[PDB]
């Protein structure tokens, strides 16, 4: 199974502004954790056709579980949007130490406010661990030596395969490669503005936007590296886990193993897609603060 533990729950979070004004946060381990048990629950029901019908009920519970969790993280809206409008000062300052300190504070208050609800979240996540784990314990076979892996196959086909091939069709190394040129430019444009050239203003902000972008790129480097791994791992693994029988225990081991592999895979792919957006979200605001190729 997968438990939740301690972790310094400060850096176990990411704050991501897809478009200008639509900022949100993650809580990696939760998202892994919930997803982990989302797959398990499916796998559990699909293993027989006698219980494929649960899909509606499970969709139900999972729809709810997110609509529950989303409502909780809502309690941090008026503090999150306190950040948003502080960002908007940073990404549109058309003084600085104060606009920085304001960002660091309004951010830390958003962290705390999340951490505060560390236990309101756990109940949702434990309720999910419950549902997913209560099935799985229900997963019966026709013959324990010789259990059927069509369960895992259908679950791979529908929910997963679509996302693998998406990652294969998108050349994420290009994606990275490009961003590292984007930063190269920012860097070149910033080195140009440096020098004794009197001293044009805003540069502080640019520096900050760039710095921020770097940290984003480095995160995207990371989740991307994990993605490409798990792709090969998932693809290798799934081959071994279909069109065959299993011993009940080895089976259960597989599903969990996969439920794990998928979860990590998705979480990354997710954060990547969010970060990617957040990357260029800054590029626009950074590009804006230029006005044109050279004022």
């Amino acid at each position: 199974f997968k438990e939740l533990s301690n972790y310094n729950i400060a850096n176990s979070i990411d704050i991501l502004q897809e478009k200008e004004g639509h900022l949100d946060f993650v809580i990696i381990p939760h998202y892994t954790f919930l997803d982990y048990y989302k797959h398990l629950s499916y796998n559990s029901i699909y293993h027989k056709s006698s219980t494929y019908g649960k899909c509606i009920a499970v969709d139900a519970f999972i729809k709810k579980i997110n609509e529950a969790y989303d409502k909780v993280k809502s309690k941090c809206n008026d503090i999150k949007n306190d950040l948003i409008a502080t960002i908007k000062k940073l990404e549109h300052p058309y003084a600085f130490k104060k606009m920085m300190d304001e960002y660091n504070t309004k951010k830390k208050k958003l962290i705390k406010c999340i951490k505060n609800h560390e236990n309101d979240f756990n109940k949702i996540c434990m309720d999910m661990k419950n549902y997913g784990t209560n099935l799985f314990e229900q997963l019966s076979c026709y013959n324990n030596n010789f259990c059927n892996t069509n369960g895992i196959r259908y679950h791979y086909d529908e929910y997963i395969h679509k996302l693998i091939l998406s990652v294969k069709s998108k050349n994420l190394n290009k994606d990275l490669s490009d961003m590292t040129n984007i930063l190269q430019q920012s860097e070149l444009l910033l080195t140009n503005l440096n020098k004794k050239m009197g001293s044009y203003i805003y540069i502080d902000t640019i520096k900050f936007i760039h710095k921020e972008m770097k940290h984003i790129f480095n995160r995207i480097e990371y989740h991307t590296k994990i993605i490409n791994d798990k792709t090969k791992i998932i693809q290798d693994k799934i081959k071994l886990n279909i069109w065959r029988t299993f011993q009940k225990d080895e089976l259960l081991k597989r599903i969990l193993d996969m439920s794990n592999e998928y979860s990590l895979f998705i979480t990354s792919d997710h954060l990547r897609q969010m970060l990617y957006n957040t990357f260029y979200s800054k590029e626009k605001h950074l590009n804006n603060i230029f006005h044109h190729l050279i004022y």
Partner: antibody
Amino acid sequence: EVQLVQSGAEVKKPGASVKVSCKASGYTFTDYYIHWVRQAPGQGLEWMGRINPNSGGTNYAQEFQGRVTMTRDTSINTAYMQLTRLRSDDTAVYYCARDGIEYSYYYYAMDVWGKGTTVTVSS
Amino acid sequence: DIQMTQSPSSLSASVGDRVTITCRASQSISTFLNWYQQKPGRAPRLLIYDASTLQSGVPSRFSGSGSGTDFTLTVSSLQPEDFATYYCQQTYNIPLYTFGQGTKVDIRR
């Protein structure tokens, strides 16, 4: 170096029990599965079960289901295999081995073996 | 419920011969099949794992092969020090099935 160390030969009567040990030394104990393969006199190898030192989970052949009981203590890095309801035929050499060659993610080979324990069942 | 059958159970081989030991699975098992040497009154030695990879340090005359049901262990030039009983083990399904009877390697003539 990498070493498996088993208890000394035992002798037990029809319808006693028998515990044998397997001290893992060299490597981290709870990494690799530890397995118990016995061998009748002048006979083939015979897989009995396994135990995940880490979890404590056990998988037994069905021949020994309900007779064998595998355990381990992580203070000492020792894995155990207790048979019960002993019989003439249970007379064998009990080996223990290490699935530490993971060759296909879930697929392992018994890379290290202990020299193995002579259990005699006589009366 | 995977039954591993080794052919010849017992055979006769002079030094410097090639020795090829067969091992058939009752069902398809991929390349999940390891090979063991066991000298009279010794612990089994792991030679070949995963049907045809060779365990570090093992003499390179031992060569695993085959797939699906039929597997082969091949000693290029049989040596004195190889006069053992050999065992093949399927790992495809995890009550690892009892290795097939194993094969005897005498001298000959």
